[PDB]
Design a protein around this ligand. Structure first.
Ligand SMILES: Cc1cc(C(F)(F)F)nc(Nc2ccccc2-c2nnn[nH]2)n1
Ligand SMILES: Cc1cc(C(F)(F)F)nc(Nc2ccccc2-c2nnn[nH]2)n1
Length: 284
């Protein structure tokens, strides 16, 4: 039963790798092309391309880790790699997750409207707010690095793997930005619903159009949240082949969330449709 599970996990990891690579590469390439040929890019475009760069870095790191675990695994068994690779992974993943959270904050501030003066101040200071949020969050990165390093050092000292708790720490420190992003998304949905309710009563229908793209983000949130809920249960519930399971699980968000951005964004959606129609045309 182990062999079939391992093969299925490897295949799903391979498809995740290729899909994430192609999606993030498409995002970065279209943004760079539009930058080169005039087309003054927007702040959202800059954030999207930076996120794509971070995600391609993360997927390359994870795929290299998998290759090292497959080819000459003796190197992977070394403690030095166990420490260095996880440190670089946590740094890159923290930066990527908080960049995504910054994109969400930019959306929430730019689009949503409220009567609370604090919200108005953050709304009109949005550009400095997101940059400070990215800079101030570095304290979380340093604390995560210190905690993971001390935990692995203690585990090694006791030994002279114990990933059930390192993965727990990673999940705990990944839920922190995710909860804020979910709360902000719910707040924006509430704002849009209230705006449309108020618009449908006084103003006639002839006069919150983003609900069309809200459906896909809800699906992504649900799927990723279910996978993460399964993660904590599986970390202690059963089995011990967590290396491949964790290696595939940690690559879902940067591999699939990018496609959601592609469909949710008008520019990326138009680029995807143009690519599809160009593929059709060249076929002749
Ligand atoms: C591909 C790879 C290899 C390694 C390792 F080489 F360091 F093992 N780590 C990780 N990062 C994780 C990401 C998500 C969940 C868990 C870990 C995790 N497992 N063990 N340590 N961190 N991803
Ligand atoms: C591209 C796009 C469009 C829409 C729309 F449906 F409102 F138009 N919504 C989102 N999502 C968010 C919305 C608010 C706050 C944060 C996120 C978020 N968090 N993580 N990723 N995006 N994104």
């Amino acid at each position: 039963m182990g062999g079939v599970i391992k093969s299925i996990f490897t295949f799903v990891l391979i498809v995740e790798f290729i899909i994430g690579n192609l999606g993030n590469s498409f995002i970065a390439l279209v943004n760079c092309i539009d930058w080169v040929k005039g087309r003054k890019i927007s702040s959202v475009d800059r954030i999207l391309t930076a996120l794509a760069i971070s995600r391609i870095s993360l997927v390359w790191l994870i795929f290299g880790s998998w290759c090292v675990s497959v080819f000459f695994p003796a190197l992977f068994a070394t403690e030095k790699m166990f420490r260095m690779l996880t440190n670089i992974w946590t740094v890159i993943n923290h930066f990527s997750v908080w960049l995504a959270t910054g994109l969400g904050t930019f959306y929430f501030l730019k689009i949503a409207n409220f009567s609370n003066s604090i919200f108005l101040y953050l709304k009109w200071r949005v550009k400095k707010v997101v940059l400070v949020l990215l800079l101030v969050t570095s304290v979380f990165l340093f604390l995560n690095i210190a905690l993971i390093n001390i935990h692995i050092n203690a585990s090694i000292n006791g030994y002279r793997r114990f990933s059930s708790l390192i993965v727990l720490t990673s999940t705990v420190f990944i839920f922190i930005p995710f909860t804020l992003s979910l709360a902000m998304f719910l707040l924006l949905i509430f704002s849009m619903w209230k705006h449309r309710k108020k618009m449908q009563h006084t103003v006639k229908i002839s006069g919150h159009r983003g609900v069309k793209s809200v459906i896909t983000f809800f699906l992504l949130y649900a799927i990723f949240s279910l996978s993460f809920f399964i993660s904590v249960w599986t970390s202690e519930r059963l089995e011990e082949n967590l290396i491949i399971l964790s290696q595939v699980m940690g690559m879902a968000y940067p591999s699939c969330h990018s496609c959601v951005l592609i469909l949710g964004n008008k520019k990326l959606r138009q680029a995807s449709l143009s690519v599809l129609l160009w593929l059709r045309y060249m076929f002749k």
